[PDB]
């Protein structure tokens, strides 16, 4: 994609699109940057993730509105048809992200920071597919999410400190997976609690700026525990 634009120009334009809140443009620019075939820096991985999280976030919010309307009507075909249209577009965005991870971001990611980041992304976009799945592959989709999150957890436990923001965001989202997708609220609560407590005990090692980064995500873990218990 965007094969005639320079890699650095795509990156520069992705940053401009974020400033303009043009997330679909942002995602297309970062897709083009990925397809240049070079590995992504820390900042570039964040741009990729921010772009697609925004795009699919708007699609998920729309799908939920329409699914709610459709369920009320089942207590013409237009509501179902339009929910299907949005659902198909959402699935296409998830497939696009998963295809970028599989060709070839993950296999070239050797460092813990990049490999865990991409595997967390892989778990997230299978989780989004699972949110809308209802057929013969719901279980396989859930298992693909679980497997990606689990491999990322294993690496992050071995290779990153308990306060690392990627390690914390990964555990947060895997706990949401357990609660919302896998029907395992006790696993969700246990993971969030253990994650929060082990980060708390490591905060003494951090600078002021890293402390702010870690405690912000710890608060999200606490907010979920408050809702779940």
């Amino acid at each position: 994609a965007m094969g005639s634009m320079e890699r650095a120009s795509l990156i520069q334009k992705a940053k401009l699109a974020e400033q303009a809140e043009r997330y679909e443009d942002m995602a297309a620019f970062m897709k083009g940057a990925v397809e240049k075939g070079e590995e992504l820096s820390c900042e570039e991985r964040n741009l990729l993730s921010v772009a697609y999280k925004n795009v699919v976030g708007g699609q998920r919010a729309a799908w939920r509105v329409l699914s709610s309307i459709e369920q009320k009507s089942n207590e013409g075909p237009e509501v179902r048809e339009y929910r299907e249209k949005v659902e198909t577009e959402l699935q296409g965005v998830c497939d696009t992200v998963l295809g970028l991870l599989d060709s070839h971001l993950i296999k070239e990611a050797g460092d813990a920071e990049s490999r865990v980041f991409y595997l967390k992304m892989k778990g997230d976009y299978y989780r989004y597919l699972a949110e809308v799945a209802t057929g013969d592959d719901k279980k396989r989709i859930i298992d693909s999410a679980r497997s990606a999150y689990q491999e990322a957890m294993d690496i992050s436990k071995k290779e990153m400190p308990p306060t690392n923001p990627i390690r914390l965001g990964l555990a947060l989202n895997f706990s949401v997976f357990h609660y919302e997708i896998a029907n395992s609220p006790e696993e969700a609560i246990s993971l969030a609690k253990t994650t929060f407590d082990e980060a708390m005990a490591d905060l003494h090692t951090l600078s002021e700026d890293s402390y702010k980064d870690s405690t912000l995500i710890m608060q999200l873990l606490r907010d979920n525990l408050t809702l779940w218990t």
Partner: peptide
């Protein structure tokens, strides 16, 4: 339940 917002960077 909130996942990481991750929509600004």
């Amino acid at each position: 339940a909130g996942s990481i917002p991750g929509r600004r960077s």
